């Protein structure tokens, strides 16, 4: 992981680790949530800490925080790959992948498909039954 990304994830961690001791406590997390309009109980805060606290000592340290942030970054990079794929297929940018668009891009990607093959692919994905693949449908097929 790049040191630029570490410094970035450190700035994020510092929003929770409000005193820079290197740990996020339930008390700190309580202040965070209160600052955003909630008023959590000790139990609720222990639950939230436990989402990230890998060694179960009841606090989150920066290595545990960074493990979580790196997993989320891989999720966001996957999501961005699928979003870019949708833009490439949606040649005219109207939010729908048509059969014509699917066939034309597949040709460019080294896969020559016939009409019936393309139509079967659209039916597999076309949850709402309108004959085209919108972004929501695409995500469902691609995840």
């Amino acid at each position: 992981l790049t040191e630029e990304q570490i410094a970035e994830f450190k700035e994020a961690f510092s929003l929770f680790d409000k005193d820079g001791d290197g740990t996020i406590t339930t008390k700190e997390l309580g202040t965070v949530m209160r600052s955003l309009g909630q008023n959590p109980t000790e139990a609720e805060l222990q639950d939230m800490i436990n989402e990230v606290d890998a060694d179960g000592n009841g606090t989150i340290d920066f290595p545990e925080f960074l493990t979580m942030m790196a997993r989320k970054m891989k999720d966001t990079d996957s999501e961005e790959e699928i979003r870019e794929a949708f833009r490439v297929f949606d040649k005219d940018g109207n939010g729908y992948i048509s059969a014509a668009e699917l066939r034309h891009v597949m040709t460019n990607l080294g896969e020559k498909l016939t009409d019936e093959e393309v139509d079967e692919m659209i039916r597999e994905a076309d949850i709402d039954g309108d004959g085209q693949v919108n972004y929501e449908e695409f995500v469902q097929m691609m995840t």
Partner: peptide, 15 residues
Amino acid sequence: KHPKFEEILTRLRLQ
């Protein structure tokens, strides 16, 4: 309501 850390981080960046 039962928020995840991701939303929390987003809102913290704002304020």
